[model samples]
Target: LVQRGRFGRFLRKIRRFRPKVTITIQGSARF
Candidate 1:
């Protein structure tokens, strides 16, 4: 349950910053 919360936060940050190509690449790897 705790792990899922962190993943949710990550998705929010990624969604907010998805316009950056480097961030998108890094976020993809993070998943």
Candidate 2:
């Protein structure tokens, strides 16, 4: 639950900065 919340916040920041590259990183981390 904590990790999920933190990941959500991280994604939000990534979306504000680099949505493209951040999404790739998210995918890698998720897998």
Best by TM-score: 1
| Predicted candidate 2 versus true structure: per-residue lDDT over 1-31, tens digit per residue | 4567577666474553544777677778888
Error of 2 at 29 (Å): 0.3
User: Can you list the residue pairs that collide in candidate 2?
Assistant: none
Model 1, 1-31: lDDT tens digits are 4557577666554544536755677768888
What 10-residue stretch in candidate 1 is worst by lDDT? 9-18
Task: State every prediction's TM-score relative to the real structure.
Answer: 0.34, 0.33
Model 2 spans > 4 angstroms off? 1-19
C-alpha lDDT score of every prediction, in listed order: 0.62, 0.64
Task: Show the lowest summed lDDT stretch of 10 residues, model 2.
Answer: 10-19
Q: Give candidate 1's TM-score.
A: 0.34
